[PDB]
Amino acid sequence: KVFGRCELAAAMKRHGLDNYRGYSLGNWVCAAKFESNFNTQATNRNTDGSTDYGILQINSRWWCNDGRTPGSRNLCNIPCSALLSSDITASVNCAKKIVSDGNGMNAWVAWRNRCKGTDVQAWIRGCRL
Ligand SMILES: [Cl-]
Ligand SMILES: [Cl-]
Ligand SMILES: [Cl-]
Ligand SMILES: [Cl-]
Ligand SMILES: [Cl-]
Ligand SMILES: [Cl-]
Ligand SMILES: [Cl-]
Ligand SMILES: [Cl-]
Numbered sequence: 268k269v270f271g272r273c274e275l276a277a278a279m280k281r282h283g284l285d286n287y288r289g290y291s292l293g294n295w296v297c298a299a300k301f302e303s304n305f306n307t308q309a310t311n312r313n314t315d316g317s318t319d320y321g322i323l324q325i326n327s328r329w330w331c332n333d334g335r336t337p338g339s340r341n342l343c344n345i346p347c348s349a350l351l352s353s354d355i356t357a358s359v360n361c362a363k364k365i366v367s368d369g370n371g372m373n374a375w376v377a378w379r380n381r382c383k384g385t386d387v388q389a390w391i392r393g394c395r396l
Contacts (some may be wrong), residue, residue, distance in 0.1 A: 271305070273391070291391075292391050293389065294378070296390035303322050310351070331361065343361035343364055345357055
């Protein structure tokens with residue numbers, strides 16, 4: 268599924284991501300924009316052989332199981348395929364664990380490089396939330 272901007276904001280709010288760990292909804296929308304362009308089906312291989320999955324590009328090195336990332340863990344206790352669903356529940360639940368892991372949203376290097384410090388409220392501007 269390819270979400271619209273306000274549509275994804277609303278879905279993230281509905282699943283409790285709004286201000287989770289102190290990160291406003293615009294931060295989460297911004298991250299999703301630059302990680303996946305709002306496409307739940309996005310996958311990308313990393314150089315090290317792990318893969319990033321879904322709307323927030325969660326990595327199989329730590330967070331989900333894909334059967335092909337030796338030495339990796341599955342800390343969200345989920346198949347990585349679950350992170351590609353139209354329903355964003357599994358990706359939000361896992362993102363909540365990631366952002367609680369100690370470095371906040373710096374875990375998403377596209378958030379750190381493209382969102383952090385910017386006018387992230389622009390991402391929810393105009394949205395009926
Ligand atoms: Cl957009
Ligand atoms: Cl915001
Ligand atoms: Cl992989
Ligand atoms: Cl997804
Ligand atoms: Cl594996
Ligand atoms: Cl392994
Ligand atoms: Cl959803
Ligand atoms: Cl980046």
